[PDB]
Amino acid sequence: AYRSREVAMKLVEKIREEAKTLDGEIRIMHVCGTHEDTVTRHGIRSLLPENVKVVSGPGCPVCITPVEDIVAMQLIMRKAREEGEEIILTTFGDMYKIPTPMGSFADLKSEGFDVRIVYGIFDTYRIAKENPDKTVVHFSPGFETTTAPAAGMLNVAAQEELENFKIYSVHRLTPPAVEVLLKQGTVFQGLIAPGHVSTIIGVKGWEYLTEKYGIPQVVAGFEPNDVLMAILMLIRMYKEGEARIINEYERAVKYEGNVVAQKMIDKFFEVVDAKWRALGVFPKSGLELRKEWKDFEIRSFYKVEVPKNLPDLEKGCRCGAVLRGLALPTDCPLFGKTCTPRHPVGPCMVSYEGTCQIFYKYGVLF
Numbered sequence: 001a002y003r004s005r006e007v008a009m010k011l012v013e014k015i016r017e018e019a020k021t022l023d024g025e026i027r028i029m030h031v032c033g034t035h036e037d038t039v040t041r042h043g044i045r046s047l048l049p050e051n052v053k054v055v056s057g058p059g060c061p062v063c064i065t066p067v068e069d070i071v072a073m074q075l076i077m078r079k080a081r082e083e084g085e086e087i088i089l090t091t092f093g094d095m096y097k098i099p100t101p102m103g104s105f106a107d108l109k110s111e112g113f114d115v116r117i118v119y120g121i122f123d124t125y126r127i128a129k130e131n132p133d134k135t136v137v138h139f140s141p142g143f144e145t146t147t148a149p150a151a152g153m154l155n156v157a158a159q160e161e162l163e164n165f166k167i168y169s170v171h172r173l174t175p176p177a178v179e180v181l182l183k184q185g186t187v188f189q190g191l192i193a194p195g196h197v198s199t200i201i202g203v204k205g206w207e208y209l210t211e212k213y214g215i216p217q218v219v220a221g222f223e224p225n226d227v228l229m230a231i232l233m234l235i236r237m238y239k240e241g242e243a244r245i246i247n248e249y250e251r252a253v254k255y256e257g258n259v260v261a262q263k264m265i266d267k268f269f270e271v272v273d274a275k276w277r278a279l280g281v282f283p284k285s286g287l288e289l290r291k292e293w294k295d296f297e298i299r300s301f302y303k304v305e306v307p308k309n310l311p312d313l314e315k316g317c318r319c320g321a322v323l324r325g326l327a328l329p330t331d332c333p334l335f336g337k338t339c340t341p342r343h344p345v346g347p348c349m350v351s352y353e354g355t356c357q358i359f360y361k362y363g364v365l366f
């Protein structure tokens with residue numbers, strides 16, 4: 001308590017002191033919704049010196065789930081129903097309300113489809129066991145942190161030979177996003193690596209970025225002091241002209257990552273080029289079930305026709321710029337006007353990890 005406040009004040013003073021002698025403006029990016037929550041909750045952007053910026057990358061797996069996949073899942077529900085098949089669709093609570101030009105999962109539910117909100121894929125497994133006569137499918141988004149438990153449940157279902165347990169895989173990888181943002185402009189000279197994701201892929205998983213682009217990195221937890229320390233460290237590393245990755249979250253992250261989880265994920269999933277809503281196609285950034293485990297993917301059972309020309313976002317939504325770290329929600333003309341948690345225009349406002357929802361949640365009036 002008193003200690004945390006003491007450290008925070010001292011860290012901000014060091015940041016100010018180091019920043020004074022910066023050539024120009026330094027941009028530090030994070031790609032983790034919880035880091036954004038911490039940053040905004042504690043007003044860290046205002047505390048920083050004018051020449052130090054914290055950029056919010058695409059750290060929301062729900063926000064970037066493609067419209068085509070949500071719509072496709074919806075079309076599979078309809079095609080299965082016309083065949084007399086009662087499918088039970090599970091989804092996280094925020095994904096449940098993600099908008100698309102053809103409606104959300106919640107809209108589908110109001111039509112009488114069996115759509116259920118779950119806390120995790122373990123609930124899907126339980127529901128599958130509760131309804132052996134019904135197909136149970138989890139629309140499954142998520143970065144490495146969420147993919148790990150999905151792989152774990154699949155391994156359990158595989159051992160049991162559960163045949164009514166499926167997923168619609170829309171899992172994504174974080175490092176590739178960081179690479180694309182860099183090549184596509186988005187300027188930043190340091191990275192705060194996500195803590196949870198790092199727990200799975202370890203320091204090892206981010207190294208290629210430092211080796212390929214020379215960008216310094218600090219793996220950090222979510223306390224405001226973890227974020228402040230990371231910022232202080234990246235500034236020093238930058239000024240000192242060094243390209244290294246420092247693990248400030250060793251209590252939860254091993255250099256090698258969680259090898260057990262990594263192996264479990266690779267056992268069922270294969271990395272493919274994948275779409276990221278409002279951002280385009282990122283090569284080798286998505287995960288799909290391997291050919292050997294195709295029976296677990298619902299698309300292996302139903303083929304549907306997603307209509308063409310479906311726009312990624314509703315008119316005026318700047319979620320594209322926001323996910324790129326090129327604009328803050330306050331830069332969006334719909335923010336708090338036509339777009340709010342009650343009536344969201346874009347995915348950035350619905351998602352729990354969404355920068356726009358985070359800005360709203362903390363009453364950012366800016």
Ligand code: SF4
Pocket residue numbers: 316317318319320322329332333334335336339340344345346347348349350356
């Ligand atoms: S405030 Fe709404 S409309 Fe604007 S960028 Fe965020 S999610 Fe999109």
